[PDB]
Amino acid sequence: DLNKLLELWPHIQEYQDLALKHGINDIFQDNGGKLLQVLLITGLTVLPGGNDAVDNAGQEYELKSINIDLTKGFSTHHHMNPVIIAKYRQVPWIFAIYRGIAIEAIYRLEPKDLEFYYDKWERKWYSDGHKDINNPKIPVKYVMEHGTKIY
Amino acid sequence: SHPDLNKLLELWPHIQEYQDLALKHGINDIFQDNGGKLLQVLLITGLTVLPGGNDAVDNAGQEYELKSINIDLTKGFSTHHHMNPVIIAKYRQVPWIFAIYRGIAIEAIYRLEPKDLEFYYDKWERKWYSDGHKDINNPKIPVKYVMEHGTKIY
Ligand SMILES: [Pr+3]
Ligand SMILES: [Pr+3]
């Protein structure tokens, strides 16, 4: 096994080198090694931790990821309210689907594809007497059904 | 879209092998919680990780306390956030493995026996009773101290 490390490490360092070039300081923390795949495939640039990335034309995106083996719904925001929703409405969303550490598929939804949920939650907020919804999920079936498959 | 994508494809088979290797050693995700870093320590020391006190055990049943730091971000190993005589008593029973990383690569690994750490244990204990039975907030062990008193395994 220690032999395996000597044979595998050189490639690992090269992967980290590639990660650094794209603004990922440590591939072994906070899904660093996973985010990199999405960035390279999609050609986006990461933004400082709101919107998570931007393309060469200056279009900002909201990025959501999921481990298909652990859950079946993308998370949004723990304290969902009209302020956040207003922000969400302005940008297209990138949905990344992983299986383990590997990227399996990537979908893009335009704001109009998410209005259904935006309107629903927004009405929810006012009807329940101004109560923040706890991280409402977006079914993977929904994204696969309404988004464009980039990968 | 990125030309760098090609590099990714060439490298991927090896990253997956690394993850495969990690699974056999009980690390679920190399890209989370320093998974890929911890694996290096396990493979070099031949230790087995322990499910979330003591953090690893060797083939002879000897348990160890394992601490690590990124020499670039700090020069002191953390201990415990609410340490008192009880935590100290647990610490005194096992040797400690100190892992030093530089970025994502291990730089050095040291082992200290309880005898090498009594200097700190006694001081922390006394302080607990002195300051009026109050838990000490994560006192640190300087890296220089571990380098001078420990056995360099890597
Ligand atoms: Pr975001
Ligand atoms: Pr521990």
From Swiss-Prot, chain A:
Residues reported in the UniProt entry to bind Mg(2+) 2: 52
Binding-site residues for Mg(2+) 1, renumbered to this chain: 52, 62
The protein's required cofactors: Mg(2+)
Reactions that this protein is recorded to catalyse: Endonucleolytic cleavage of DNA to give specific double-stranded fragments with terminal 5'-phosphates
Gene3D superfamilies named among the record's database cross-references: PVUII Endonuclease, subunit A
Cofactor note: Binds 2 magnesium ions per subunit.
MF-aspect GO terms: DNA binding; metal ion binding; type II site-specific deoxyribonuclease activity
Domain of life: Bacteria
Enzyme class: hydrolase
BP GO terms, sorted: DNA restriction-modification system
Subunit structure: Homodimer.
Protein name: Type II restriction enzyme PvuII
Protein's organism: Proteus hauseri
